[PDB]
Amino acid sequence: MLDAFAKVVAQADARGEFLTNAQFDALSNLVKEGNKRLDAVNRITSNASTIVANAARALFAEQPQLIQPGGNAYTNRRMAACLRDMEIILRYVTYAILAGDSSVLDDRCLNGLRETYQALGTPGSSVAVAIQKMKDAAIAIANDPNGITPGDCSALMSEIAGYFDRAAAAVA
Amino acid sequence: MLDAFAKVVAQADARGEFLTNAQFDALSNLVKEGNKRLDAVNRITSNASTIVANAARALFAEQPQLIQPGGNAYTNRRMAACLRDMEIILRYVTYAILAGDSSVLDDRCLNGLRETYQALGTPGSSVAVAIQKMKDAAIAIANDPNGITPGDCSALMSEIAGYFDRAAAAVA
Amino acid sequence: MLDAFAKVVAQADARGEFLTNAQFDALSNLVKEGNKRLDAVNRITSNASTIVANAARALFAEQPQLIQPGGNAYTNRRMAACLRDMEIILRYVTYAILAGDSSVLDDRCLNGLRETYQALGTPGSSVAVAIQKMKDAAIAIANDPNGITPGDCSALMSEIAGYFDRAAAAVA
Amino acid sequence: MLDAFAKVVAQADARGEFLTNAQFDALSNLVKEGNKRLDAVNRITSNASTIVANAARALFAEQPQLIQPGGNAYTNRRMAACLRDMEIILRYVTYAILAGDSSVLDDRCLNGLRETYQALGTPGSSVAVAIQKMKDAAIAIANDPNGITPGDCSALMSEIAGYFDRAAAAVA
Amino acid sequence: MLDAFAKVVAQADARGEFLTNAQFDALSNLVKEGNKRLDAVNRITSNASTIVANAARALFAEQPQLIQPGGNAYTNRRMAACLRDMEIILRYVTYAILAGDSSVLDDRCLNGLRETYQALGTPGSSVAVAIQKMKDAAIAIANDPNGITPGDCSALMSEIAGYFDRAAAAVA
Amino acid sequence: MLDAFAKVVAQADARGEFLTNAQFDALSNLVKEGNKRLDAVNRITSNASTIVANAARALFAEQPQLIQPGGNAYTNRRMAACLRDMEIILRYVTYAILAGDSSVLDDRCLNGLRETYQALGTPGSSVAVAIQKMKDAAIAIANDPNGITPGDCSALMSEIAGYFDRAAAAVA
Amino acid sequence: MKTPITEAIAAADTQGRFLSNTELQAVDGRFKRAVASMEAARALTNNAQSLIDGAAQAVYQKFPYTTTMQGSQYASTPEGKAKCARDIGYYLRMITYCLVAGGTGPMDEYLIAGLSEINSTFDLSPSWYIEALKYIKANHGLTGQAAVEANAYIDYAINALS
Amino acid sequence: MKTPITEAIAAADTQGRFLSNTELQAVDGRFKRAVASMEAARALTNNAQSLIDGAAQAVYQKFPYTTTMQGSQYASTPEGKAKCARDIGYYLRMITYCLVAGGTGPMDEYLIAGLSEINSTFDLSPSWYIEALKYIKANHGLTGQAAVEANAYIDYAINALS
Amino acid sequence: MKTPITEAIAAADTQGRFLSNTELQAVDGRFKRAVASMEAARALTNNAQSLIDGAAQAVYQKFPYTTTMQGSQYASTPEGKAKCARDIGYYLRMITYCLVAGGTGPMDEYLIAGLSEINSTFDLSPSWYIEALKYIKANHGLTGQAAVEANAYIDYAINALS
Amino acid sequence: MKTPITEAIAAADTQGRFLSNTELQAVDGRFKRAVASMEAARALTNNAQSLIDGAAQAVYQKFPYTTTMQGSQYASTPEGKAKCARDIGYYLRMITYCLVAGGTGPMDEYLIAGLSEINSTFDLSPSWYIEALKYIKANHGLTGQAAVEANAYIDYAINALS
Amino acid sequence: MKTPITEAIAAADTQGRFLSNTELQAVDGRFKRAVASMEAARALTNNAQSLIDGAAQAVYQKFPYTTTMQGSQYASTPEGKAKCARDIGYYLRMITYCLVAGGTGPMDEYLIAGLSEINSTFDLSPSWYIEALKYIKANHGLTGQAAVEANAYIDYAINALS
Amino acid sequence: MKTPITEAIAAADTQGRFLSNTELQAVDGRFKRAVASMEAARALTNNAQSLIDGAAQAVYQKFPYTTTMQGSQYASTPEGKAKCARDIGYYLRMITYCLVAGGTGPMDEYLIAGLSEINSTFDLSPSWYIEALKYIKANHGLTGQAAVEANAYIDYAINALS
Numbered sequence A, B, C, D, E, F: 001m002l003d004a005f006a007k008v009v010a011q012a013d014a015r016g017e018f019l020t021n022a023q024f025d026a027l028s029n030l031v032k033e034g035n036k037r038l039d040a041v042n043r044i045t046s047n048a049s050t051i052v053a054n055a056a057r058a059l060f061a062e063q064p065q066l067i068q069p070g071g072n073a074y075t076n077r078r079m080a081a082c083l084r085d086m087e088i089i090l091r092y093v094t095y096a097i098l099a100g101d102s103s104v105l106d107d108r109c110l111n112g113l114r115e116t117y118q119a120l121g122t123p124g125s126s127v128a129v130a131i132q133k134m135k136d137a138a139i140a141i142a143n144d145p146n147g148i149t150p151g152d153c154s155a156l157m158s159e160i161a162g163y164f165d166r167a168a169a170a171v172a
Numbered sequence G, H, I, J, K, L: 001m002k003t004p005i006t007e008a009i010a011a012a013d014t015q016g017r018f019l020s021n022t023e024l025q026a027v028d029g030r031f032k033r034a035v036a037s038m039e040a041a042r043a044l045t046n047n048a049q050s051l052i053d054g055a056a057q058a059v060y061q062k063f064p065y066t067t068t069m070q071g072s073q074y075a076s077t078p079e080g081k082a083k084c085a086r087d088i089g090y091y092l093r094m095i096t097y098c099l100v101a102g103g104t105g106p107m108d109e110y111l112i113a114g115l116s117e118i119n120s121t122f123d124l125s126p127s128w129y130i131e132a133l134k135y136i137k138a139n140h141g142l143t144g145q146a147a148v149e150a151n152a153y154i155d156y157a158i159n160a161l162s
C-alpha cells in the first residue's frame, strides 16, 4: 500500500528524478491539513458501531426481502456476515482517509469483491446501498461543527466521499 | 451433506414454514423402512472386497487393452489406483444409501471426477462399465431372500440403482 | 525427470518389450563418451559466475533501457532477480547436460516461464538475448583445447547448444 | 479412552482369555441400567449453564479475595478463564458418566492440571471448592423425582459423585 | 513487554487504585526528558555497525584463543554467530532505552541465554567482555557534546549503563 | 554424520594443521580395502529380510513370554513394531559399514533409544539378544567364501562386529 | 447439517473407511427414537400459534419495560411487536426442525451461528428469549418421551443464550 | 478403543462441546442392540473349542499342502499345528470382544493393525484365515439378529484379509 | 501491553531490525500528545467519586427496572448497588490508565478481553454500561484536546460494548 | 525415475546449487559400472524365453497345488498359465531395465509401487514369485561382476516380496 | 512502502481492527516532524549536483586506485566515471525520498534489497559508497533538526553497507 | 559433512530405505577417484609454504594499496601481513580437506558459511582472495587428473567469492 507521500516518491523514481518545488509545495500542504484528517478518522472511527447498525436497519427497512426467509441476509449466520462486511468496508475506508490514498482500499478490500458476491449469490447492488448509507452518516459525523475548532474541511469531505463511492462502484 | 431428513428441513426453511402433514407422513414412512435400509448397507458393505475384485476381473476380461503394456491399468501402481477408485466409488454409494440422499456422493465424490479422468487420460467410459458391474452385484447381494425376514425391498433396490447410475453418468 | 538411459527404458516399457541390440549399442556409446560429458559440466560449472556476469554486462550495454529508471532491471531488487534468473537458467542447463535429456530443464525450469514473464511485465525476448550470450561463452569454455586430452567433442557441443536454444525459445 | 465395556475387554485380552459368565452377567447389567444413565447425562447437560454460573457465584461469595484486585479471578480475562475451566471440568465429567469409566476424564482433563495451576499461580484448592459445588447441584438435578418414571438411581448417583470427587482431588 | 508508563499502570491495577500525584508527577517528568531519550537511541543505533565491529576486534585482540583453531569463534560460521549475537544484544538494549524498562530485554533476550551458552560450550564470561565494550562505546557516542543542544543527560546515561550491565551479568 | 574420511579432516582442523603422511597413508589404505566394504554392504543388505525374520523367530523360540498374551510383542501391532525396530537397527548398521564410522548409527539411531524402551516398557535386554542374533547371521553372510574373489576380510568383519555390539550395548 | 446420520458417515469418512456395525447401531438408535421425536414435532406444529402468542405475552409480562421503552429494539411499537412474535416463531420452528432431523443441526446452522453478534448489534437481550423458551417448555402439554425430546432442544437453546 | 460410546464422546470432544441428543440416541442405539450382541458373544464363547477344532480342519482340508509341506510357516509339524489353532483362537476371541464392546475397536487395535506386515514377514497366507472364518460363519449355529451380529464381525475380518 | 512505544518496538522486532526514524517519530508523537492525555487523566482521577456516583444514577434513571427487579444481576439490593458502582469505577479507572499509557492496552487486557463472556454468564446488559459511559462523556467537564483524548477512550469502550 | 544420475541432480537441486565434484564422482561411478551392468542386461535378454519357461516350471514344481487347485488366481487353466508366464516375464524384463538404467528406478515405479495391494486383491502368493526369482538367480549363467549386478536386482525384488 | 503511516495501518490491519488513538499519535508524530524533513529534502535537492560532484572526488581521493586500475568496475574510464557519479546520485536521490516519505521505505525497496548481491556480482566495494556518504554527511550544510533528519538516513545507508 | 559417502546414505535415509546398487556405485565412484584426489592433496600439502608465500605476494602486487593504506583491514602492518598469510593458509588448507574427503563439505562448513558476513564486517575484499586463489591455480604444478581435482575446488572457492 502507499500513502499520499510514497505515491509521489514512486512516481518520481520511475522517472529517475528529484522532487520539484511544485511537488514539495503540494506535499507540504497535505501536512498543513493534517489536523483535519486526524479528526475525520477519529470521529468516524469513534462512531463505527452506530454507523454500521443504523445503516443496516435502513437497508432492511428499504429492502425487506433481504431478511425474509430465503433472503441473502436471512438466518443469523448470513446476517452476521452482512454486518461484518459493512464494518470491514468501513474499516478500509478509514485507512484510506489516514493514508490519503485509496491503494490500501483497492488492494486489500475491493479487488475480487465483485467476483466474490457473484459467486456467493449476494446482491452486489444491495451492498452499494448499504455503503452509500454509511457514507452519508460518516460525512455527517465528520464535519459536524460542534465540539471543534471552526474552519473549512470541505475538500477533505469530498475526498472522503470519493473512497465511499469508489467502494460502492466496485460491487454494484 | 444432507440426509433425507435434513433435506426436507432445508426446503421448509427456505420458505420459512413448518412441516405439513404430507411431509410428516412421508418422513414417518422412511423411518418405517429403516430396517430394510440397514440390511442393504450391511450386506453390500459386508461383501465390499468381493464386489470390487469380481467386477474388475470382468472389466479386464472384457477390455484386455486396459492391462496390455501402455494401457491405463498397466503396472501395479496404475492398477492399485484403479482398484482404489472402484472401492471409493462403492464407499460413497453406501453412504448415500444410509443417508437416503445423494448429496454426500455428489459433493465429496462425483464432482470434479470427470475433469480428473480427462486430465489423467483415463477412459471415463471404462470406469462406467466398472461401476455398472458393481451395481449388478451389489443389488444381487442386497435383495437375496436367503438369511432374512421376507418382505418387499423393491423400492429401496430401485433407489440403490439410482446412486450407481448417477455415478456412472458422472464420468462416462 | 529422466536421464538418457531411463528415457529408453520408459519407451521400451510402454511397448512391453526388452531392449534391442540397436538400443544396447546406442546406450553403450553414451557410456563411451561419458568422460567428455563430465568435462563439459565441470568446466561450465567451474566458470558459472564469470559466464553470468559477463553476459549480463553485455546485455546491458546492448539494451541500456533495461537499466534506465523505469526499466525492468532498474533498482537492485529487480537487478538481483535478473541475475538470479540467469544463474538459474544456466543451472538447469548443466543438469540436462549431465542427464543427456532435457526433461529436467523442461519440467522444473522452462514450463510456466513464459506466462511468468508476461504477467511480471518482463521483456521475454530480452531474456533470450541473455541466454544466447551464456550459450556462446559456455560452449567456448567447454571445448577449449587447452588443459585436456585432445579429441572430438563436436557432437556434445551441438547437444549443449540445443538445451540453450531450447530455453531461449521458451521465453522469446 | 475406554468405556466400561472396552475396559473389561482390555483386561480379558492381557490374560488371553474369553469372557466369563460373571463378566457377561456384570456387563449385561450395565445395559439394563442404561436408561438411568442417559437421563443423568441429559439432565446435567441440559442445565450446564445454570450449574456453572450458580457454583461460581457461590465460590466468589465464599472467597471474595479471588475477585478483589490482584486476585486470580480479577479482570474479565482471568474470570472468563475461571468460568471456562469450570465448564470444561463439568464437560469431561459428563463424558465419564456416559462411558461408565473415568479414563477420558483422567487422560484428557485431569493429568497435568495440578502442574498447570501450580505454574499459573492459581489456588488449586479454590478450584476444588468450585467443583464440589457443581457436584451437589449436578446430583440434585440428576435424581430429582419430578418429571420421570420412578425407580432407584442411588448407585448411579454414587458413581457420579465419584468422578466429581476424583477431579477435585486432582487439583486440591 | 512494558514501557515505563505501562509499568506504573500495571502496579496501580494490582492494587485496584487510581494514580497518585506522585506518580503523575513522576511520569510527567519522563515525558520532559523524552528528547534526550530519542537522541540516545538515534545516535547509538546510527553507529550500530561501528560499535559491534570495533568491540569484537578488541575482544579478539584481548583473547586471541577465541579465534585460534578450536576456539569458539574459529571458522566463519562461528564468527558470524558471535557478531550476530553482539548485534542482537545491542538491538534489545536500544529497545529498553526507548521503553524506559528492561522487560523487553529480559523476556526476549536475556532469559535462557546463560543456559544456551552453557549447552553450546561458549565462554559466557567472554561474551560479558564483549558487551562491556559496546557499553563504553555506546555511552561515549550517546553523550558526546558535539552536534546537539547542551544540557545534562547524566541520569539517562546511568540508566543506559544499567541495561548493559544487566545483560553482561546474565551470561557471565 | 561423518565418514572415516571427514572424521580425520575434522580432527585436523580443530588443531589447525594439514594432514600428515601417517594420515595420508592410513586413509589411502581405506581406499584400498574399498572393494571388500562394498561387498559386505551389498550382501548383508541383499539378505535384509531373511536376517530379520530368522533372528526374530529365534528370539521368540528362546523367550516365548514376549509373545504370550500380555507380552511386549503380543498383538500384531506390537509385533510389527518389534520387527520394524530390528530392520531399523540393521539399516543404520549398514550405513556405518559404508561410512567406516559409527556416527550416523549413534546420532540417528542409538541415542535416546534406551530412554525410549524404558518409557515404553520394552525389555531392552531382549532387544540386545535380537541384535546379537542378526550380528552372527550378518557376518556369516558377509564373509562366506563362495561367490567371490578370495582374500582376507577379517579386519572388516571385526569392525562390522563392533557396530553390532555397539548397538546391543546401547539398549541392554 | 448435523444429524445422527451425517455424523455417522462423517466419522467413517474421515477414517477413510466403510460404515461398520458401530455406525449402523447409531442410525438404528435414531430410527427408534424418531417415534417420540415426530410426536413432539407434530404437537408443537399444530399448536404453534397459541404457544407463540402465549410466549410473547410471558415476555412482556416479565419485562414490562420492553413494551413502554422507546427504541427500535423494543416492542413498544406495532412494528416491534411483529418482529418480536416473528423471532419467537423462528425459535419454535427451529426446535421442530431439530426433532424431525434428530439433531441440533438445523438450529446450529440457522440460529446459533452468529447469535451473540446479532443480539449485540441490535441490542436484543438474551433473557427475553430465555423467558419465551421457558414458557414453551412449561406449556407444550407433551408427556413421556415426547416431552423429553422437546425439552432437550428447548434447553439446548437456553444454554446457547447463556 | 473404537466403540459406539467412545465414538460418541470423541465427536463431541473435537467440536469442544457437551453431548447432545444426537450422541445420546447413538448410545441408546448400541444399548438396544446389546441384547443380540451378548447372545452371540455367549454362544461363540461356550462353543469356542469345537468351532476352533472344526475351523482348523477345514483349513487343512482345503489347503492340504499346509500339512505336508516343509517350513516353519506350515502346520506340517505338531508345533506348527499348535500355532495354527492358537491363531484361530485369536480370531474367534477377537470377534467376541467386538460383540461385547459393540464395535470393531478390539479387533482393530489387537488384530488388524500390523496384520499385512506379519502375514508378509512370516509367509502366512490370508486365504488360510479367510477359510477358517468362513467355517465359523457357516457353523456357529446362531439365528436371527444374533447371527447378523456375529456375521458382521466375521465378514469385517474377511475384508481386512483381502 | 499495547502502547505507542511497545507497538514501535514490536514492529522493529518482528522485522528483526534496529529502530529507525520511522518508529522514533511515533514515540515523539506520543510524547507530544502526553500533555493533553495527562491533563485528562488528572481531571478524571480528581473527580472520580462524583462522576461515578453520577453515572450510577444515570443508569438507574434510564433503566429503572434494574432497581426494582429481583435477581442477583440487578441493583435492587444494597449488594447489587455496590457491585454496580464498583463496575463503573472499573471502567473509569481503566480509561485513565489508557490516557497515562497513551493507548488502549490497559483496557484491552484488563477489561475488553472476556467482556462478552462475562456479560453473558452473569446476565449483565451492555446498554447499562454504555449509558454510564455516555454520562461520564457529557459531564467530565474537560475542554479542548483534553476532551478529545478522554472521549477517544470512552467511545472506544462504547464500541466494545456494541 | 531413480537412477544414479537423477539422484545426483536431485540432491544438487534441493540444495539449490550447481553440481559439484561430489555429484560428478557419483556419475562416473555409474559410468564405470555400466560395463558389467550392460553385460548382464544383454545376457538376460538373449536368454529371456528359456529362463522364463524354466522359472515357471520351478514354481509349479515347488507349489504343485497351483496347477490343480480351482480358482482364477491359479495356473490350473491354460489362461492362468499364460498370466503366470506373463507375470514372470514382467519381473525379468524389469530387472534388465534396472541394469540399463543403473538403479532400482524402473522396478520401483513399474513393479514395487502397489505390489502388496495387487497380490492381496487377486490372491497371488509372494512366495510364488520369490521362487521364480531364485530360479533365475541360480541359472542366469553369469559370472564375475556381471553376476553381482544381476543378483543385486534379483535380491532387491525378493526383499520387496517379503 | 514503509512509512510511519503505512506502518500505522498495517499494525491495525493485522490485528483486524479500526485505527485507535495509539496509531493516530504516531501519524501526528510524523506530521510534526515533516517540517524538518522537508527542509532537509529541499536543501539536498537544490544542492544535488555540487554534493554529487564533491562526493565523487572524495571517493577518488581516498581510493586513488579506482581511477588508474583497469577493469569495468573501476572509474578509470569516462564510462566508469559516469556510472560512478550516477550511482552516487542514486544514493542522494534515495535519501531525499526517505525524508519526503518520513521513513526508510523508499531506500529499502529501491536500494537495500539486493544490494550485497549486486556489489558482489559486479565487484563494487562498499567502502567506496560509505566514503561518498560521509562526504555528503560532512558537507550538506544543514543545521539543527534538519541535519539530524538528513544524517539519520545517511547513517542508515552506511550501516546497510557494513 | 558433505561427502560422496554421506550424501549416499542421506539419500537412502530420507527415503527410509536400505542402500541400493544406486548408492553403492556412487561410493565406488569416489573410491576410484580418490587416487587422483590424494595425489593433489599430498602435493598441495608438501608445497604449502611456498604457494602461500607466493600467493600473498601476488595479492600485494595486484592491489598495492593493501600494503600502504592505513587501517586494520589492510596488510600495511606486520600484524596485517600475518593475518593475511594466515587467511591464505586457511584457504589452501581447506581445499586439501576437500580433496581428502572427496567433496566440498569441509570448505562449506568451515569457510563458505558466514563468508559474506565476515568480509562485510571487517572490510575485507573478495577480489583479494580470488587473486590469491588464481595464483595457486596457476602454480600448483600438478598435471593430469590431479590438476582437474585441485582446480575443481579452487574454482569452487572462486565462485563462492563472487
Ligand SMILES: *[C@@H](C)[C@H]1/C(=C/c2[nH]c(/C=C3N=C(/C=C4\NC(=O)C(CC)=C4C)C(C)=C\3CCC(=O)O)c(CCC(=O)O)c2C)NC(=O)[C@@H]1C
Residues within 6 Å of the ligand: C035, C036, C038, C039, C040, C042, C142, C143, C144, C145, C146, C148, C149, C150, C151, C152, C153, J021, J024, J025, J028, L033, L144, L145, L148
Ligand atoms: C571436450 C569437452 C574436450 C575434450 C575432452 C576429453 N576428455 C577426455 C578424457 C577424460 N576426461 C576425464 C574427466 C573426468 N573424469 C571424471 O570422473 C570427472 C569428474 C570428477 C571428470 C571431470 C577423465 C578422467 C578422462 C580420462 C583420462 C584423461 O585425462 O585422458 C578425453 C579422452 C578420452 C579417451 O580416453 O580417448 C577427451 C577427448 N577434449 C577436447 O579436445 C575438448 C576441448
